[PDB]
Design an enzyme around this catalytic site. Structure first.
Site, PDB file in Angstrom:
ATOM      1  N   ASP B  25       0.532  -1.234  -0.038  1.00 13.66           N
ATOM      2  CA  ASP B  25      -0.098   0.009   0.035  1.00 13.66           C
ATOM      3  C   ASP B  25       0.884   1.415   0.105  1.00 13.66           C
ATOM      4  OD1 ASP B  25      -2.007   1.902   0.614  1.00 13.66           O
ATOM      5  OD2 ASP B  25      -2.954   0.724   1.753  1.00 13.66           O
ATOM      6  N   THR B  26       1.050   1.970  -1.136  1.00  7.61           N
ATOM      7  CA  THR B  26       1.672   3.162  -1.078  1.00  7.61           C
ATOM      8  C   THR B  26       1.157   4.455  -0.497  1.00  7.61           C
ATOM      9  OG1 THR B  26       0.762   3.606  -3.567  1.00  7.61           O
ATOM     10  CG2 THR B  26       2.921   2.338  -3.149  1.00  7.61           C
ATOM     11  N   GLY B  27      -0.391   4.260  -0.430  1.00  9.99           N
ATOM     12  CA  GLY B  27      -0.938   5.417   0.303  1.00  9.99           C
ATOM     13  C   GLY B  27      -0.808   5.256   1.887  1.00  9.99           C
TER      14      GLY B  27
HETATM   15  C1  LIG Z   1      -5.171  12.901   6.309  1.00 10.00           C
HETATM   16  O1  LIG Z   1      -5.448  11.762   5.940  1.00 10.00           O
HETATM   17  C2  LIG Z   1      -4.605  10.799   5.682  1.00 10.00           C
HETATM   18  O2  LIG Z   1      -3.421  11.276   5.695  1.00 10.00           O
HETATM   19  C3  LIG Z   1      -4.995   9.821   4.939  1.00 10.00           C
HETATM   20  C4  LIG Z   1      -3.729   9.144   4.192  1.00 10.00           C
HETATM   21  C5  LIG Z   1      -4.353   7.874   3.435  1.00 10.00           C
HETATM   22  C6  LIG Z   1      -5.669   7.215   3.585  1.00 10.00           C
HETATM   23  C7  LIG Z   1      -6.156   6.134   2.914  1.00 10.00           C
HETATM   24  N1  LIG Z   1      -6.215   4.613   3.570  1.00 10.00           N
HETATM   25  C8  LIG Z   1      -4.958   3.538   3.899  1.00 10.00           C
HETATM   26  C9  LIG Z   1      -3.808   4.159   4.646  1.00 10.00           C
HETATM   27  O3  LIG Z   1      -3.642   3.525   5.863  1.00 10.00           O
HETATM   28  C10 LIG Z   1      -2.457   3.775   6.797  1.00 10.00           C
HETATM   29  C11 LIG Z   1      -1.547   3.014   7.495  1.00 10.00           C
HETATM   30  C12 LIG Z   1      -0.566   3.356   8.269  1.00 10.00           C
HETATM   31  C13 LIG Z   1      -0.593   4.846   8.584  1.00 10.00           C
HETATM   32  C14 LIG Z   1      -1.206   5.421   8.193  1.00 10.00           C
HETATM   33  C15 LIG Z   1      -2.603   5.410   6.947  1.00 10.00           C
HETATM   34  C16 LIG Z   1      -4.618   2.891   2.327  1.00 10.00           C
HETATM   35  O4  LIG Z   1      -3.503   3.579   1.960  1.00 10.00           O
HETATM   36  C17 LIG Z   1      -5.765   2.634   1.364  1.00 10.00           C
HETATM   37  O5  LIG Z   1      -5.272   2.046   0.408  1.00 10.00           O
HETATM   38  C18 LIG Z   1      -6.954   1.982   1.813  1.00 10.00           C
HETATM   39  C19 LIG Z   1      -6.652   0.975   3.058  1.00 10.00           C
HETATM   40  O6  LIG Z   1      -8.081   0.099   3.094  1.00 10.00           O
HETATM   41  C20 LIG Z   1      -8.486  -0.817   2.605  1.00 10.00           C
HETATM   42  C21 LIG Z   1      -9.941  -1.308   2.973  1.00 10.00           C
HETATM   43  C22 LIG Z   1     -10.223  -2.545   2.302  1.00 10.00           C
HETATM   44  C23 LIG Z   1      -9.570  -3.524   1.492  1.00 10.00           C
HETATM   45  C24 LIG Z   1      -8.200  -3.078   1.186  1.00 10.00           C
HETATM   46  C25 LIG Z   1      -7.760  -1.473   1.871  1.00 10.00           C
HETATM   47  N2  LIG Z   1      -7.752   3.040   2.108  1.00 10.00           N
HETATM   48  C26 LIG Z   1      -9.132   2.718   2.048  1.00 10.00           C
HETATM   49  C27 LIG Z   1      -9.901   2.931   0.600  1.00 10.00           C
HETATM   50  C28 LIG Z   1     -11.215   2.037   0.477  1.00 10.00           C
HETATM   51  C29 LIG Z   1     -11.644   1.763  -0.520  1.00 10.00           C
HETATM   52  C30 LIG Z   1     -11.556   2.879  -1.725  1.00 10.00           C
HETATM   53  C31 LIG Z   1     -12.162   2.742  -2.823  1.00 10.00           C
HETATM   54  O7  LIG Z   1     -12.051   1.600  -3.417  1.00 10.00           O
HETATM   55  C32 LIG Z   1     -10.343   3.531  -1.493  1.00 10.00           C
HETATM   56  C33 LIG Z   1      -9.797   3.819  -0.392  1.00 10.00           C
HETATM   57  S1  LIG Z   1      -7.790   3.824   3.786  1.00 10.00           S
HETATM   58  O8  LIG Z   1      -7.725   2.934   4.936  1.00 10.00           O
HETATM   59  O9  LIG Z   1      -8.552   4.884   4.023  1.00 10.00           O
HETATM   60  C34 LIG Z   1      -6.381   7.965   4.321  1.00 10.00           C
HETATM   61  C35 LIG Z   1      -6.074   9.320   5.044  1.00 10.00           C
END
Ligand SMILES: COC(O)c1ccc(CN2[C@H](COc3ccccc3)[C@H](O)[C@@H](O)[C@@H](COc3ccccc3)N(Cc3ccc(CO)cc3)S2(=O)=O)cc1
EC number: 3.4.23.16
Lengths: 99, 99
Positions: B25-27
């Site tokens: 997960d690059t995000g």
């Molecule tokens: C200020 O806000 C930020 O900085 C902010 C930055 C990034 C995110 C994104 N998120 C994390 C990051 O996790 C971490 C880990 C460690 C420390 C900090 C964050 C990750 O990157 C994402 O890929 C997935 C993970 O979730 C899933 C769920 C189910 C199955 C697979 C993966 N996201 C969810 C998602 C679900 C469905 C769709 C649409 O399909 C798009 C996106 S998330 O959980 O939201 C949110 C807020």
């Protein structure tokens, strides 16, 4: 280009004639953007991740430019804290993970 | 190797002598795993996802093998949807995004 992961992979995208900053997210199945207005009809959907679920509006066949590369796909719009470019669009620009 | 994104970038990791599946997960800034037992003391941390923030346990200097590549770093444990390998460990194995 080759993007290292020492810092968050943030890029500039163009959608609806608007320039925004988005995170290239390989963990995301779809693309989700902060509240904004888009043309066409939409369908409600619920997506979840760490922290729970949020309600978004699903728009199909939307054109987006990522770092100069045009792509077409579904875009989800809702109260996300950050703009996320998911796999549905990353595949269209030929993005791969390498190590 | 080179991993395309037409499907989720799931890989096998080895931690505590056991094999598990995890998402590259690059995000994600950090690595978060499903509830499990790890050695040593832990510290508290709050992380934010699309749905809000959650409390997790932070363990440091944990050995983890990703696709055969050995890494040693910080691992967070909590109520995550799936095991997530974040940037802290992707940089250790020399993973980059390309297009
Ligand atoms: C200020 O806000 C930020 O900085 C902010 C930055 C990034 C995110 C994104 N998120 C994390 C990051 O996790 C971490 C880990 C460690 C420390 C900090 C964050 C990750 O990157 C994402 O890929 C997935 C993970 O979730 C899933 C769920 C189910 C199955 C697979 C993966 N996201 C969810 C998602 C679900 C469905 C769709 C649409 O399909 C798009 C996106 S998330 O959980 O939201 C949110 C807020």
């Amino acid at each position: 280009p080759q993007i290292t992961l020492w810092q968050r992979p943030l890029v500039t995208i163009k959608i609806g004639g608007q320039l925004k900053e988005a995170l290239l997210d390989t963990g995301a199945d779809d693309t989700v953007l902060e509240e904004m207005s888009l043309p066409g009809r939409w369908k409600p959907k619920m997506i979840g991740g760490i922290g729970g679920f949020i309600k978004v509006r699903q728009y199909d066949q939307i054109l987006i430019e990522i770092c100069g590369h045009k792509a077409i796909g579904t875009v989800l719009v809702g109260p996300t804290p950050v703009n996320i470019i998911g796999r549905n669009l990353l595949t269209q620009i030929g993005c791969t993970l390498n190590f």
